[PDB]
Design an enzyme around this catalytic site. Structure first.
Site, PDB file in Angstrom:
ATOM      1  N   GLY A   7      -8.678   9.198 -43.202  1.00  0.00           N
ATOM      2  CA  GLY A   7      -8.273   8.058 -42.412  1.00  0.00           C
ATOM      3  C   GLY A   7      -7.396   8.374 -41.219  1.00  0.00           C
ATOM      4  CG  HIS A  64     -16.454  10.628 -37.637  1.00  0.00           C
ATOM      5  ND1 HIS A  64     -15.793  10.464 -38.836  1.00  0.00           N
ATOM      6  CD2 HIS A  64     -15.521  11.043 -36.748  1.00  0.00           C
ATOM      7  CE1 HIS A  64     -14.513  10.748 -38.674  1.00  0.00           C
ATOM      8  NE2 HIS A  64     -14.321  11.099 -37.415  1.00  0.00           N
ATOM      9  CB  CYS A  86     -10.565  10.381 -37.818  1.00  0.00           C
ATOM     10  SG  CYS A  86     -10.943  11.926 -38.664  1.00  0.00           S
TER      11      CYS A  86
HETATM   12  C1  LIG Z   1     -11.043  11.635 -40.263  1.00  0.00           C
HETATM   13  N1  LIG Z   1     -10.707  10.525 -40.731  1.00  0.00           N
HETATM   14  C2  LIG Z   1     -11.350  12.944 -41.024  1.00  0.00           C
HETATM   15  C3  LIG Z   1     -10.068  13.833 -41.088  1.00  0.00           C
HETATM   16  C4  LIG Z   1     -10.221  15.161 -41.851  1.00  0.00           C
HETATM   17  C5  LIG Z   1     -10.558  14.937 -43.347  1.00  0.00           C
HETATM   18  C6  LIG Z   1      -9.267  15.187 -44.149  1.00  0.00           C
HETATM   19  N2  LIG Z   1      -8.400  15.896 -43.210  1.00  0.00           N
HETATM   20  C7  LIG Z   1      -8.882  15.916 -41.899  1.00  0.00           C
HETATM   21  O1  LIG Z   1      -8.297  16.452 -40.978  1.00  0.00           O
HETATM   22  N3  LIG Z   1     -12.541  13.658 -40.443  1.00  0.00           N
HETATM   23  C8  LIG Z   1     -13.573  14.211 -41.249  1.00  0.00           C
HETATM   24  O2  LIG Z   1     -13.495  14.126 -42.452  1.00  0.00           O
HETATM   25  C9  LIG Z   1     -14.795  14.949 -40.605  1.00  0.00           C
HETATM   26  C10 LIG Z   1     -16.054  14.002 -40.618  1.00  0.00           C
HETATM   27  C11 LIG Z   1     -17.081  14.297 -39.490  1.00  0.00           C
HETATM   28  C12 LIG Z   1     -16.478  14.132 -38.088  1.00  0.00           C
HETATM   29  C13 LIG Z   1     -18.370  13.462 -39.599  1.00  0.00           C
HETATM   30  N4  LIG Z   1     -15.096  16.187 -41.388  1.00  0.00           N
HETATM   31  C14 LIG Z   1     -14.151  17.160 -41.828  1.00  0.00           C
HETATM   32  O3  LIG Z   1     -12.982  17.008 -41.536  1.00  0.00           O
HETATM   33  C15 LIG Z   1     -14.574  18.411 -42.609  1.00  0.00           C
HETATM   34  C16 LIG Z   1     -13.811  19.023 -43.606  1.00  0.00           C
HETATM   35  C17 LIG Z   1     -14.216  20.187 -44.294  1.00  0.00           C
HETATM   36  C18 LIG Z   1     -15.425  20.889 -44.090  1.00  0.00           C
HETATM   37  C19 LIG Z   1     -15.809  22.178 -44.880  1.00  0.00           C
HETATM   38  C20 LIG Z   1     -17.128  22.562 -45.211  1.00  0.00           C
HETATM   39  C21 LIG Z   1     -17.447  23.744 -45.919  1.00  0.00           C
HETATM   40  C22 LIG Z   1     -16.477  24.659 -46.358  1.00  0.00           C
HETATM   41  O4  LIG Z   1     -16.828  25.793 -47.044  1.00  0.00           O
HETATM   42  C23 LIG Z   1     -16.900  27.016 -46.329  1.00  0.00           C
HETATM   43  C24 LIG Z   1     -15.139  24.323 -46.043  1.00  0.00           C
HETATM   44  O5  LIG Z   1     -14.126  25.180 -46.443  1.00  0.00           O
HETATM   45  C25 LIG Z   1     -12.831  24.620 -46.671  1.00  0.00           C
HETATM   46  C26 LIG Z   1     -14.855  23.132 -45.331  1.00  0.00           C
HETATM   47  C27 LIG Z   1     -16.179  20.256 -43.072  1.00  0.00           C
HETATM   48  C28 LIG Z   1     -15.783  19.088 -42.373  1.00  0.00           C
END
Ligand code: A1ALH
Ligand code: A1ALH
Lengths: 304, 304
Positions: free
Chosen positions: A143, A41, A145
């Protein structure tokens, strides 16, 4: 002669952390030999994370859109392929700090060290366990990830985890080093219900054994149980069913303490049904389950 | 966005660990530049640890009685001197992996990472706090002496601790990198009564702030207190008296959460007097005090 949550020395792993940048998104990468692994991603725009069609995104990407930096000296990408949820970049330089390494898929209950990275530089290291629902309860920010989870056996690094995502319940999900997610998760900004998190029963028992080793032994009672009856009360308390396999793993620990494994299950039974009554075991008022039988032994043996 | 006990990456420190052997005793040493530092009781026979006259032991020692091994390549000692409870050996080679380093004496309440070593090889890393009675509650076995405690600021390593001894209450004592013991301890096999261990009050508050940051916020009440009244109940519960200095350190944290520092003291007051009632904060049923205000910020900021 104490007992604390230990993490593997991170030195052998920091020498593989690079910064991978595609467009505006930037994350961490694992540089082994002439290959750099990173979450796929990175090719995602901040508005495409809602529903990304990764195949129609990688085609619009060439080699030169990927800026791989190892320190302040950048790497030229020559080839790039995708494997499940991981991205692989071929660089014209093999990492001279590449260790003896391995890609292994671990099992629920097993533990590993996590090297939390930001912009390719390490920020810290902590120990984690793969929960039975294939999530982990780590500490990760934007960041982070591409940070990896690993074990070390003498001189060989076993890479088992790479960070991808945070779940709504505050826990974390990721892939093995082959890009295959642990659990029924996908790289996608959507509410993903993690399963019910049971307690790793074999780990709690090993932790109770480390307590007896460490002088803390107020919980041993004069009772006993069978594997079947202990299991019955374990499911009412959302504990993993104990198998004969688990019993045999605790055996080495059972031998060093002189407490039969089944007698330890009895003390844990009454502990579950009656609580700690404000007392503490090894400085915790909860039953800890992120210490595998292996972890307890190597800590009480000075394994290097 | 989680919160766990993190430890500094150990890579920069593993490159300074050597094995120091004198007679039969063998322990760990810290190799910086052309000097190797180690606990002075390496010159102690297993029967002389009862009451050792270190000055009449070092005179009977020459350079060639010290076998310094860095990996499987050994170092020649050319000069040796003693500083308090530390031994300094001059080697004909400057450690090419020597980092930007510093020798600093930390204060009670401050935290640092510990690299537990055995036979000069690292076994693991964990985070520790200097308790108000100048002990630490680490995990150490035979041969762990000479393992160091350290902090990392960007690129410079601050060496603050070196392991020497285990106390009767199961906790641990050691020296700074100048050989001066933290607390009223001496290198001698005898029952040494550690003082009463108070709770680092400013650290508990910072931990409660990290909880509010992390969604865990069931403990905030609608009450308030003054610094004087809060202190009064803090001494009945063996907590460190909170100073205006401590209040100012928590300020940055107070600003990010919007909870005045004095209001957080109020929530901690009622928490101390009424207990957690079986609830848990950040996955612990105890009040944690090994997170300095600095530690909480750098973890919620991704400091590398
Ligand atoms: C990588 N750099 C990040 C690391 C995450 C973000 C901050 N802390 C971490 O551990 N990866 C991401 O941001 C991925 C991106 C994808 C792989 C394209 N997505 C998420 O981490 C993420 C966070 C939260 C939700 C979410 C959606 C809906 C909710 O309501 C019910 C909810 O409740 C808290 C959370 C989805 C995806
Ligand atoms: C270094 N390699 C070791 C590390 C210690 C031993 C195992 N775990 C550790 O943390 N350092 C030592 O062994 C030093 C040697 C000194 C510096 C010459 N001594 C001790 O660590 C030590 C242990 C225990 C006692 C002790 C005496 C009497 C007791 O009865 C009241 C008692 O109660 C438990 C303990 C003294 C010194």
């Amino acid at each position: 002669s104490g007992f604390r949550k230990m993490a593997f020395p991170s030195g052998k792993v920091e020498g593989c952390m690079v910064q991978v940048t595609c467009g505006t998104t930037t994350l961490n990468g694992l540089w082994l030999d002439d290959v750099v692994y990173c979450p796929r991603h990175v090719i995602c725009t901040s508005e495409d994370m809602l529903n990304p069609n990764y195949e129609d995104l990688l085609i619009r990407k060439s080699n030169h859109n990927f800026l791989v930096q190892a320190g302040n000296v950048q790497l030229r990408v020559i080839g790039h392929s995708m494997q499940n949820c991981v991205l692989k970049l071929k660089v014209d330089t093999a990492n001279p700090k590449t260790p003896k390494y391995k890609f292994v898929r671990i099992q629920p209950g097993q533990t590993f060290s996590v090297l939390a990275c930001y912009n390719g530089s390490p920020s810290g290291v902590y120990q984690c366990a793969m929960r039975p629902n294939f999530t982990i309860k780590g500490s990760f920010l934007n960041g982070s990830c591409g940070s990896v989870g690993f074990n070390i056996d003498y001189d060989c690094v076993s890479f088992c985890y790479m960070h991808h995502m945070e779940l709504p319940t505050g826990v974390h999900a990721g892939t093995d080093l082959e890009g295959n997610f642990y659990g029924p998760f996908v790289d996608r900004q959507t509410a993903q219900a993690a399963g019910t998190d049971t307690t790793i029963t074999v780990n709690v028992l090993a932790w109770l054994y480390a307590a007896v080793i460490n002088g803390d032994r107020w919980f041993l009672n004069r009772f006993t149980t069978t594997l079947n009856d202990f299991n019955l009360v374990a499911m009412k308390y959302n504990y993993e069913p104990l198998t004969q396999d688990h019993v045999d793993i605790l055996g080495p620990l059972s031998a060093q303490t002189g407490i039969a494994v089944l007698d330890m299950c009895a003390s844990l039974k009454e502990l579950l049904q009656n609580g700690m009554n404000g007392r503490t075991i090894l400085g915790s008022a909860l039953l800890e389950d992120e210490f595998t039988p292996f972890d307890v032994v190597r800590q009480c043996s000075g394994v290097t």
